[PDB]
């Protein structure tokens, strides 16, 4: 009996092996095409951006703002209150380097594009209703339930920042 059942036992092993492989193929086809990955997460960016300047970029179809900002602008951020927000968030808990700020380039009120280096806070200015924002973009004048989106970014080299 042991011999015969061994044959059966071995056979199932083979059937199992292929089974898993086959399924992993069909499921993997639904994950994401190579082009999707190529177009996404590819957001290497130089650190040469001067202080206060805001060079516009594109990311997942969303315009993206990367700004180096002078120390006095960061002092102006301290003037604005992080407890005066619908979703409070401590300053350094938002930006890993206060002199660096990476944020989305679309306002949450009507999809309008804020004007860089403008507004009463020295941050962003939406002409659609004259809405004002700070360098950090804290929701101040608008229906936005929480603050402006903090995109996920990771520093790998001192000169590049991955954003994906």
């Amino acid at each position: 009996k042991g011999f015969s059942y061994l044959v059966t036992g071995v056979t199932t092993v083979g059937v199992a092996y292929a089974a898993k492989n086959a399924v992993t193929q069909f499921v993997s086809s639904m994950s994401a095409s190579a082009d999707v990955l190529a177009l996404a997460k590819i957001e290497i960016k130089l650190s040469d951006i001067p202080e206060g300047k805001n060079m516009a970029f594109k990311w997942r179809g969303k315009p993206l703002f990367v700004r180096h900002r002078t120390q006095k602008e960061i002092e102006q951020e301290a003037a604005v209150e992080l407890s005066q927000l619908r979703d409070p968030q401590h300053d350094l808990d938002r930006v890993k380097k206060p002199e660096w700020v990476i944020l989305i380039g679309v306002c949450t009120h009507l999809g309008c594009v804020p004007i860089a280096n403008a507004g009463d806070f020295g941050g962003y200015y939406c002409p659609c209703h004259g809405s004002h924002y700070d360098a950090s973009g804290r929701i101040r004048l608008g229906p936005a339930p929480l603050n402006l989106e903090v995109p996920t970014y990771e520093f790998t080299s001192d000169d590049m920042v991955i954003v994906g």
């Binding site: 042991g2 011999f3 061994l6 036992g9 199992a16």
Partner: protein
């Protein structure tokens, strides 16, 4: 006079179907790694130099 290998394999494992299934799946876990590694090594040994992973040396790390 020693009891045959198959007889021991039967009484301890194959007699109970639940253990029979358990040994099958563990064998799959092990055989998958072994079979995959062996087949890959054979394929590479058939085509030394052609595969780009053997070419990385001539140009790498700048």
């Amino acid at each position: 006079a020693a009891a045959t290998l198959t007889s021991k394999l039967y009484s301890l494992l194959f007699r109970r179907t639940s253990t029979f299934a358990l040994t099958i799946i563990v064998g799959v876990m092990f055989f998958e790694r072994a079979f995959d590694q062996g087949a890959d090594a054979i394929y590479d040994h058939i085509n030394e130099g052609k595969l780009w992973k053997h070419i990385k040396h001539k140009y790498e790390n700048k």
